[PDB]
């Protein structure tokens, strides 16, 4: 994340971050004890993920770390990277042992359909992730997270590539400076109400921090919420 | 200042308390606003449900709550049932 700041411990307790041949090359949020939802362009046919929960500062050792191995990946059906790298981009990984909940460890929020679109339109997300600090800078090492506003589709059009406005949404400022960056895909775009966050959107990719485009774009969590609950349920 | 609730200004059966030159009506489940005279309904601040608002068959709101949260017995607020319930920050 470029232009945000540090969250505090346990701020973002459904954040986890992905590892593999190289740390936090993506984010990702718990759904449950055994699931996480994330990037489909995170998740290729060959390579091992490792989930990391109640994490913050990623070279230090705060006791509140889970680390969980992925047993199952499910993308979307209709992802293919061939046709269009970011749409449908939304995948669920299953854990081999379940994380243990607690304040550092806690699920995000899902709505139905209706009401996950009625939150995003409230018009301010929080994103965050342990991505570059800025282009082709440095990966954080502590957690940020940032507040960006919804841009409409018009504007999101006109300014950003491979943006297809049913499945995705763009977010950010009119100014730019302010975007997710590479590591951060993945992880989770949410709107919190009265103090409760819901899931809103899935970090695609930092169009303005890759220099490619004037917002970051997001998959919209909306049309995913019954493929999510039914894949993620755990009775 | 004298009683503004001996006209009886509230309907819907709302209960009328007598304040400095003003009444308030308290209403029964189901109704609203300051004569009681609107029925509560999703569209007007989300049928006063803290999460999620539905019509019920006999038109009727029925408020519901994600996992992890119950419907409080008010039957609009919605309250933990297990211990991390999502979307909270706890530290
Ligand atoms: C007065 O209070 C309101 C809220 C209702 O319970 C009435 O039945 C009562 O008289
Ligand atoms: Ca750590
Ligand atoms: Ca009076």
């Known amino acids: 994340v470029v232009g945000g700041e540090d969250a505090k411990p346990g701020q973002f307790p459904w954040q986890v971050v992905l590892n593999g041949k190289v740390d936090a090359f993506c984010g990702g949020s718990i759904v449950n004890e055994k699931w996480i939802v994330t990037a489909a362009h995170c998740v290729e046919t060959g390579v091992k993920i490792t989930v990391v929960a109640g994490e913050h500062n990623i070279e230090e050792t705060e006791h509140t770390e889970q680390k969980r191995n992925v047993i199952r990946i499910i993308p979307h059906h209709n992802y293919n990277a061939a046709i269009n790298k970011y749409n449908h981009d939304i995948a669920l990984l299953e854990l081999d042992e379940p994380l243990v909940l607690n304040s550092y460890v806690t699920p995000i929020c899902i709505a139905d359909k209706e009401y996950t679109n009625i939150f995003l339109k409230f018009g301010s997300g929080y994103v965050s992730g342990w991505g570059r600090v800025f282009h082709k800078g440095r990966s954080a090492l502590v957690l940020q997270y940032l507040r960006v506003p919804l841009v409409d589709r018009a504007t999101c059009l006109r300014s950003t590539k491979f943006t297809i406005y049913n499945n995705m949404f763009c977010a950010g400022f009119h100014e730019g400076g302010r975007d997710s960056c590479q590591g951060d895909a993945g992880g989770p775009h949410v709107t919190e109400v009265e103090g409760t966050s819901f899931l809103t959107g899935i970090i695609s990719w930092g169009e303005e921090c890759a220099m490619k485009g004037k917002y970051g774009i997001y998959t919209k969590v909306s049309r995913y919420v019954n493929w999510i609950k039914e894949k993620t349920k755990l009775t | ?91």
Not at chain 2, 35 to 42: A, P, R, S
Not at chain 2, 60 to 68: F, L, P
């Open chain 2, 1 to 91: 200042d004298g009683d503004q609730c001996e006209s009886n200004p509230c309907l819907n059966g709302g209960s009328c308390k007598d304040d400095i030159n003003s009444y308030e009506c308290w209403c029964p489940f189901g109704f609203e606003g300051k004569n009681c005279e609107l029925d509560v309904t999703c569209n007007i601040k989300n049928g006063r449900c803290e999460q999620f608002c539905k019509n019920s068959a006999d038109n009727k709101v029925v408020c519901s709550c994600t996992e992890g949260y119950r419907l409080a017995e008010n039957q609009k607020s919605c309250e933990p049932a297990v211990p991390f319930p999502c979307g909270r920050v706890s530290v």
